[PDB]
Structures are given as structure tokens and as C-alpha cells.
Amino acid sequence: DPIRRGDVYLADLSPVQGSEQGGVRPVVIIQNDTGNKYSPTVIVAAITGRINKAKIPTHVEIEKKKYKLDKDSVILLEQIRTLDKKRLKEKLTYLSDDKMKEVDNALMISLGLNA
Amino acid sequence: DPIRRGDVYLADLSPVQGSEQGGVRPVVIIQNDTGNKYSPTVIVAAITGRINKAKIPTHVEIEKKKYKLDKDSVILLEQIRTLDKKRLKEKLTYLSDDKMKEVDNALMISLGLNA
Amino acid sequence: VQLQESGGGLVQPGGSLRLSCASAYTLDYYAIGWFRQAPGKEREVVSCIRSSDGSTYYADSVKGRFTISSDNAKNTVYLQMNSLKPEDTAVYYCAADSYLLEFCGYYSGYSGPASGRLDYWGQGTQVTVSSHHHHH
Amino acid sequence: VQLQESGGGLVQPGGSLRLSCASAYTLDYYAIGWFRQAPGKEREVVSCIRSSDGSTYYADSVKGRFTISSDNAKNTVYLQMNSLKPEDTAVYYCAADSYLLEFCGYYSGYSGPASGRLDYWGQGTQVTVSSHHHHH
Ligand SMILES: [Cl-]
Ligand SMILES: [Cl-]
Ligand SMILES: [Cl-]
Ligand SMILES: [Cl-]
């Protein structure tokens, strides 16, 4: 029932424009858990199967078997957005602690943070 | 010509759903400058005039006069998204260093980061 | 007038009271919370709700004793208070703001505001839990 | 075959050469870059372009001497090389990937990959800048 940071949901991202990531696809919850509990929206990063290897420092690979995916995928920490909770469809899986540490580092790079 | 982290642009955020922030409005560039230079997309946080005081730790106030706004506004670090660069319209202003430090801290809170 | 509380009064320890917060606007306009304040203290969060979905917040001190709920037809939010204790005695206020439920979540739990950051406040209603005031 | 370079050869120091990278696909499918590699060294970024917009990357060693450009009609990307130096001698490859221009920006800058992460590569073409090989 509770939406947790690091959960992976199916979500309809369309409509989008240009090079924005669209379609119905898995996304990872990256908003903090207090916002997850009490906000009407969540913040997510897109996951794609169209590539299967990290290409840049904002990319994090996720394996087909351990997570519940159609194919080896990659989390795009340069593709983030805020979604009303109604967009979230099936909960598919959730990332390991080690994986989320990779996501945190790519998110720090993506957003120009450093500490 | 170069899009810099901390710049404030007018951008068309619509269409949106539910409690997502929509409409044409100022947004602040929060993506790192390397992504700003070489990606087709930028990552932004929405600014609204519908409130004029920070309400939660993910809110950062910005003053009507120093920045070039219709009214005292607040940056919503819980309202972030990735936009194709074509969405960016007029460049309106850019945040001071001190202001961007406030934005960084709210972004760390919003995204569950800490370092 | 915007928000208006009613339903305070005197109760013996162990008793119940139901507070009502009458909103001038339909309950989808904002989240609504109950706060309480004793003499010389800051207003503290008791319970919050965003009526358009079901989402609630309860302070640790009132969990399993108080229940917040919505009546959309009457644009009213209720605080059902059971198993009341002398230490629940306070002035009870309702408040409303677009960001009130997140406010309850982030600060109750406590970074620190003045609480005057939320847009709308009732006038407050006295709740006294006592076996020493007549009535009971 | 996907990518195919042509236009290498021998030039005297100070001369010019134009390399061509013929893409099997229209140039909106990916960004395209030129890399170079000397014996026993890793392939290094020279210049990159995303043809659908104008965006480019140039390595510090070739700035103001080399120019990358697109010919959409011929699905070809060119590297115009002026003021060539002996130290520009290398095998020159073109490469293509949806994320190639960001790759050029982030790593030239140099975290570290194997460069085999980019999807498409030509076979390479030899560029020799020398006043000692005959021809000139
Ligand atoms: Cl896909
Ligand atoms: Cl793992
Ligand atoms: Cl507005
Ligand atoms: Cl300032």
C-alpha cells in the first residue's frame, strides 16, 4: 500500500514532446518517503529497454532476471519527472540497497549536486 | 546562448494530469551544465505565483523584484521534470549563488539524498 | 468567516467529543488539519486530512484515540475524540491550506515554522477534560 | 556494413584532409563522432555532432583546426581537418550512438569506459601527417 523510494511501478508517461521519454513503462520512485506518504504526486526516473548498457554517468543498469523486466534495462537519471499518483499502475518490483546507491550517485551527477 | 544551471526560463508545461503543475510558467534549470550543453533535454523545477510563501522543506521563495517576476513566487522542488529544449521560451533571469544553495538543499530533501 | 469550529466543551476523562470544522469552500480546495494549543505554548499538529483522496496524518499522542474524517455534502471535517485524557485539554483550531497535509507530515516529527504559514484558520474551540469542573 | 569512413591518406604537415563517415541510416537516428587511435593506445574522442540539432563537441587538441558537419542528403558526416600536425597521425574511426554526443561531453575531460559501449563503429581510416613518406 505505501509508495516507497526505490519501488518500480508501471506508469503512463505519455503524452511527451521531442526527446522526452514517453509511453507506458517502468519508472523508479526517487522522491523521499515523507513526500511519498503525504504528497498527491511522486517523482520518478524513467527506465528503458531500448538500450541495455549504461552510456553516460547518469545511467544505471538493471538486470532482466533480478528485477521483473522484459529485458535488460537502464534507469535514466536524466529523465525524471513528477507524476500524479493516479498514473502509477502495477507495482513491478523494488531496487536493492546497492542498486539504489548507484541511482543516488547518478542522480547527484544529473542534478549538479555534490556532497 | 548556453543553457546554465540556475537560469530561469518561461516554458509550456502543459498538458499535465491531476496535481502535476501545468501551464506556461517560469521554471529553473536544475540539470548539471554538462548535460545542459550536450543533451537534447533539460531538467527543471516549476515556479508558481499561486503561493508566495514556502510551505514545506521542498519550497524555496523567490522575490518579485530581484528576479523578473509578476509576483512573489516559490520554486517547487517537488515539481520537477525533463523537458525537450524546444519547450524553453524566453530566458527571464537567473538565480543568485545564495539562492541556488537554497535550491540545492531543497532538492536534496525532495529526492531523499543526503551528504 | 472561512473556517469555523464547533463542538468543544467539557468532558470527563475517558469521555468522547466530536469537533466539526465547517469550511466555506468545498473540501477539494485544500487539505484540512486540527491543531491544539495550551497556554503559552505553540500550536501543535493533532490530525490532518486531504479530503479529495483519503490521506491522513495523526500525531503520536492521539493515535488510536482520535479519527479525522470528511463530510463532503456539508463541507465539514470532523475530529472524533475518544478516550480523552486531562492532557488533551487545549484550544483546538482547524486550519486549511493547499499544502497542509505535507506540512503535517514534514514538520510533525520538526524543522520549525511559526504555523502562520498556513492560509486559513478557525477561531479555536475550548476542549476541557476534567473531573473537577461542574457539569462533570 | 553500417558506418564507413573514407578520405584518409598522406598529407604534409600543414595540409588539409576531409574525412567522410557514410551512415546507412538517416542522420537523425543517432549522434556521430570521430575518434582516433595510435598504436597501443585507447581510442580518443576528436569531434562529435548531433545532426538533428547543431550541437558539437571538439577535443581541446583539435579546436580551431577541425570542423565536423552534416550532409543530410548523403547521410554523411564530414571531418574537415586543416593545419594538420604529425601528432594528428592515427587511425580515425567514426562511431554512432543515440547517446554519443553526451558521451563525448561527459568523458572527454574522464571517468572511464572501454568505448565499446557505443553501438556502431566504422572500420577506421589511416591519417598520416609526414614530410617523409613519398607522395609528400
Ligand atoms: Cl522500451
Ligand atoms: Cl543488484
Ligand atoms: Cl501562476
Ligand atoms: Cl537572493
Q: Are A28 and A8 spatial neighbours (Cβ–Cβ below 8 Å)?
A: yes
Closest alpha carbon within chain A to D118: A55
Rounded distance between C-alpha atoms, residue D106 and residue D103, angstroms: 5
B8 φ/ψ angles, rounded to the nearest 5 degrees: -120, 120
The 3-state secondary structure of B20-83 reads CCCCEEEEEECCCHHHHHHCCEEEEEEEECCCCCCCCCCEEEECCCCCCCCCCEEEEEEEEEEE
Q: Which helix (H) or strand (E) is D9 found in, with range?
A: strand D9-11
Note the Cα D12 to chain centre separation in Å. 19
**Lookup result for grid cell 572500420:** D123
Q: Are A104 and B65 spatial neighbours (Cβ–Cβ below 8 Å)?
A: no
Sign of CA dihedral D93, D99, D101, D105: negative
Mind telling me how many Å the CA of C105 is from chain A's nearest CA?
Answer: 6
> What cell was used for A14?
505519455
Rounded distance between C-alpha atoms, residue B27 and residue A34, angstroms: 24
Nearest to residue C97, comparing CAs of C29, C45, C37? C29
CA dist list (Å): B17 to A7, A87, D56: 21, 9, 36
Rounded distance between C-alpha atoms, residue C55 and residue C108, angstroms: 15
Burial group, residue C117, by CB count within 10 angstroms (0-12, 13-18, 19+): middle
Rounded distance between C-alpha atoms, residue D30 and residue C55, angstroms: 46
Rounded distance between C-alpha atoms, residue C97 and residue C87, angstroms: 27
DSSP state of D73: T
Q: How many CA within 13 A on the CB side of residue D123?
A: 8
Rg of the Cα trace of chain B? 13
Q: Are A69 and A62 spatial neighbours (Cβ–Cβ below 8 Å)?
A: yes
Domains, chain B: 2-115 (2.30.30.110)
Mind telling me how many Å the CA of B83 is from chain C's nearest CA?
Answer: 25
Ligand 4 ion local residues (Cβ < 5 A): B 96, 99
- Of all ligands present, the nearest one to the C-alpha of B66 is 4
- Of all ligands present, the nearest one to the C-alpha of B61 is 4
Cα(B27) to centroid(ligand 4), Å:
17
Rounded distance between C-alpha atoms, residue D19 and residue D21, angstroms: 7
Beta bridge partners of C21: C5, C77
Name the CATH superfamily housing domain C4-108+110-129. Answer: Immunoglobulins (2.60.40.10)
CA dist list (Å): C37 to A25, C17, D85, D118: 48, 17, 80, 63
Nearest to residue B36, comparing CAs of B6, B61, B60? B6
Q: What is the dihedral of CA D45, A74, B16, B99, to 10 degrees?
A: -60
Between chains, do B55 and C111 touch, taking CB under 8 Å as contact? no
Mind telling me how many Å the CA of A77 is from chain B's nearest CA?
Answer: 10
Q: Which of A78, A100, A114 to mutate against chain B (most B CBs within 10 Å)? A: A78
Q: Are C4 and C22 spatial neighbours (Cβ–Cβ below 8 Å)?
A: yes
Nearest to residue C98, comparing CAs of B63, B44, B19? B19
Print burial letters for A69-81: b (CB count within 10 Å at least 16), e (below 16): beeebbbbbbbbb
DSSP state of B16: -
Q: Which residues contact B96 (CB under 8 A, 6 or more apart)?
A: B66
Cα(B74) to centroid(ligand 3), Å:
10
Q: Are B101 and A21 spatial neighbours (Cβ–Cβ below 8 Å)?
A: no
- Of all ligands present, the nearest one to the C-alpha of B71 is 3
Q: Where are the domains of chain D?
A: 4-108+110-129
Rounded distance between C-alpha atoms, residue C89 and residue B99, angstroms: 43
Q: Which residues contact B52 (CB under 8 A, 6 or more apart)?
A: B61, B71, B72, B73, B74
Rounded distance between C-alpha atoms, residue B59 and residue B2, angstroms: 27
D29 φ/ψ angles, rounded to the nearest 5 degrees: -75, -20
The 3-state secondary structure of C64-75 reads CCEEEEEECCCC
Rounded distance between C-alpha atoms, residue A101 and residue C93, angstroms: 43
Q: Which residues contact B46 (CB under 8 A, 6 or more apart)?
A: B13, B21, B25, B27, B75, B76, B79, B80, B81
C32 contact A CB<8A: no
Rounded distance between C-alpha atoms, residue A110 and residue A104, angstroms: 10
> What cell was used for A33?
518517503
Rounded distance between C-alpha atoms, residue C96 and residue C127, angstroms: 20
Between chains, do A55 and D111 touch, taking CB under 8 Å as contact? no
Q: Are A23 and A15 spatial neighbours (Cβ–Cβ below 8 Å)?
A: no
> What cell was used for D128?
598520416
Task: Please name the amino acid found at residue D6.
Answer: S
Rounded distance between C-alpha atoms, residue B35 and residue B85, angstroms: 12
